[PDB]
Design a binder for this molecule. Structure first.
Ligand SMILES: O=S(=O)(O)[C@]1(CNC2CCCCC2)C[C@@H](O)[C@@H](O)C1
Length: 658
């Protein structure tokens, strides 16, 4: 249909604009759609963009509003005191503010659907909420509506929720337009989506992005596909990947690099209310925190991730057990058989399950998928599914059988309930991935796995050496391979920290010289340097000039291939805030060749200081642009759990940054 009203170029300068005469007589029927293209790069803390109200004395709670907050939250109110209805629907981190020095034109579509009794909000082509109610309130049927307003709500003849911004276009339709119709509305987005709700992963949530530029020019990304809301392990989480062959313009349909099948891949709306939001899938195995590198020797792409057994995460992993028995310099995975209270078995050569107490082999073997075989034949378990149909999270068997895996809750043989690191490889630059293999333990029989630093591993320029950063209590633990990941050794570097989440990323400043930037508990990003290709490490220093919170956030880091201001350059990506995970920046530093020190010369704001920015991935695209894939929300805040389509990709040029 055609809009019953359409106007534009409205400047909202803390002063309401009345559009009553142009709109109120046209409002008809119980279903409406509002389409609004608007900018707000200096919003007030809470402001209404559009209001429909009964403006009379005594009726201050009779109105409809579309509002936003300076946090980037968008919402609506739908209120009628005589009907006893007071609806408030919203979602944090729904908006953009600025991009490349210009206010972003956000495209908002709000559908009020009387037949399905549903209110649905889209911003920038993303469905941010969809709420069905028992008693529907048509926005046109609020008792005594007599005012239509831009940039405020008129209550008792006075302006509430005054807005600063502009509405470039606004249209109203007397119909609830379909999802299909919504998708045809042209957007002006500064970002794109690589992974998204409803894609091939069937995860509704994503966290922990990575990017890496391959020698062929293909750009590869990995991610946590998180099924049970945004929670870290314990949960159901898989590692997914996608690549671009056109410098980030388009991306492949995602595939899995590491996955478990003990729980179904379900697209679930995870509850955001204060009773249920901490609901957590508690019987599933998971992978978490991935990292990518390309190997020059084999040409293979190598991906590492943490592996969590069923119901295990950082908080409950056995810190004093590696999960392996060392026997004469060989490490064997320990197993516990159902019924036993101890681990009386090991996985030996050729996958033979060996009884340690009788020193004889059993009739059981483990294949390369870590699946259990008895007399060469595959054992199975029954898969689980999750639901909230009873009002709380329930995890239950679903009638489907899958191969029995030693990482599963239902397995006859189970691994130690602790965290591990696994690796997979791809021989076709991310078009498929091999079955994962566990890395050996690096800190002895009585220490859990170190924790992989998400992002990039480091391939050295003048050798075939690969390095992956990991952390544990009291140190960074660099994992080094000189043979395409076939064998590994550790290089430990002490850090002035107990129990820190010391997520670290590396850049090669010049041949054999590596600088590692890492998260701390001090509110400052730290660094150390190696001058022997990772064998040994310097004391720790700190960057003055970038702020983090007390708990910190992952920092991603690259060495740019081109000179900037005639100097070699490093680029960091991080929130720059003492307060929260917000105020995302790229920080460009120039290297002083005298002493390898870095002058942090340029700061580019990704978006408003108050808008969310958490974990991030950066890479130089083959065309010398910079690609950034990042969590556009505050991933620490307990108010911003379980948001869909907040991991977003942008393309920047060096001139944008300087
Ligand atoms: O120098 S590499 O370590 O091989 C790497 C790629 N360099 C190309 C150089 C040519 C321009 C594009 C980026 C940098 C890391 O951030 C990864 O993306 C891999």
């Amino acid at each position: 249909i055609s809009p019953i009203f359409q106007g534009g170029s409205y400047q909202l300068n803390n002063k309401s604009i009345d559009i009553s005469s142009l709109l109120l007589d046209k409002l008809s029927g119980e279903s409406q759609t509002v389409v609004m293209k608007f900018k707000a790069d200096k919003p007030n803390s809470l402001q209404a963009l559009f209001g429909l109200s009964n403006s009379k004395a005594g009726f201050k709670n009779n109105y409809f509003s579309i509002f936003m907050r300076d946090s980037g939250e968008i919402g609506v109110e739908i209120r009628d005191a005589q009907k006893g209805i007071n609806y408030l629907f919203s979602r944090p981190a729904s908006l953009w503010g600025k991009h490349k020095g210009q206010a972003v034109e956000n495209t908002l579509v709000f559908v009020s659907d009387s037949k399905d009794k549903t209110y649905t909000m889209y911003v920038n082509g993303i469905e941010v909420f969809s709420e069905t109610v028992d008693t529907f309130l048509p926005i046109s049927n609020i008792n005594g509506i007599d005012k239509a307003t831009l940039g405020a709500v008129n209550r008792e003849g006075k302006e509430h929720y005054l807005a600063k911004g502009s509405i470039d276009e606004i249209s109203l339709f007397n119909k609830a337009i379909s999802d299909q119709e919504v998708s045809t509305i042209p957007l002006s987005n500064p970002f794109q989506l690589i992974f998204q709700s409803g894609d091939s992963t069937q995860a509704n949530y994503f966290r922990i992005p990575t990017l890496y530029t391959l020698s062929s020019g293909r750009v590869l990304s990995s991610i946590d596909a998180r099924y049970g809301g945004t929670h870290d392990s314990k949960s159901k989480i898989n590692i997914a990947t996608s690549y671009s062959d056109d410098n980030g313009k388009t991306w492949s349909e995602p595939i899995f690099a590491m996955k478990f099948n003990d729980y179904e891949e379900q697209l679930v709306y995870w509850p955001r209310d204060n009773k249920l939001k901490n609901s957590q899938i508690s019987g599933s195995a998971s992978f978490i925190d991935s990292s990518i590198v390309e190997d020059k020797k084999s040409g293979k792409t190598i991906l590492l991730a943490d592996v969590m057994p069923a119901g295990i995460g950082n908080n409950n992993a056995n810190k004093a057990d590696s999960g392996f028995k060392e026997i004469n310099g060989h490490y064997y995975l320990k197993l516990k058989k159902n019924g036993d209270n101890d681990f009386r078995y090991t996985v030996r050569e050729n996958g033979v399950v060996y009884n340690e107490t009788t020193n004889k082999p059993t009739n059981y073997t483990i294949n390369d998928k870590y699946e259990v075989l008895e007399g060469g034949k595959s054992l199975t378990v029954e898969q689980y599914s999750v639901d909230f149909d009873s009002g709380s999270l329930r995890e239950r068997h679903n009638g489907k059988q899958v191969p029995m895996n030693v990482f599963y809750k239902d397995s006859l043989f189970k691994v130690t309930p602790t965290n591990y690191i696994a690796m997979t490889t791809s021989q076709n630059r991310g078009e498929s991935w091999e079955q994962f293999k566990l890395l050996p333990p690096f800190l002895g029989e009585k220490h859990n796995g170190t924790y992989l630093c998400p992002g990039q591993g480091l391939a050295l320029k003048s050798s075939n050496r690969l390095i992956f950063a990991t952390y544990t209590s009291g140190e960074l633990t660099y994992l080094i391979s000189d043979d395409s990941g076939q064998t590994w050794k550790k290089s430990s570097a002490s850090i002035p920290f107990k129990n820190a989440t010391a997520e670290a990323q590396m850049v090669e400043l010049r041949d054999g010289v590596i600088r590692t930037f890492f998260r701390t508990t001090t509110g400052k990003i730290a660094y150390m340097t190696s001058r022997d290709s990772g064998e040994t490490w310097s004391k720790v220093s700190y960057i003055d000039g970038i702020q983090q919170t007390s708990y910190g956030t992952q920092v991603s880091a690259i060495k740019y291939s081109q000179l900037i201001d005639g100097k070699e350059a490093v680029i960091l990506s991080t929130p720059n805030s003492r307060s929260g995970r917000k105020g995302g920046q790229l920080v460009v530093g120039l290297v002083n060749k005298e002493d390898d020190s870095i002058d942090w010369k340029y700061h580019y704001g990704i978006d408003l200081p108050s808008y969310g920015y958490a974990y991030s991935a950066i890479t130089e695209l083959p065309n010398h642009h910079i690609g950034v894939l990042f969590e556009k929300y505050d991933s620490w805040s307990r108010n911003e759990l379980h948001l869909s389509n907040v991991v977003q990709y942008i393309d920047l040029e060096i001139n944008d940054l300087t």
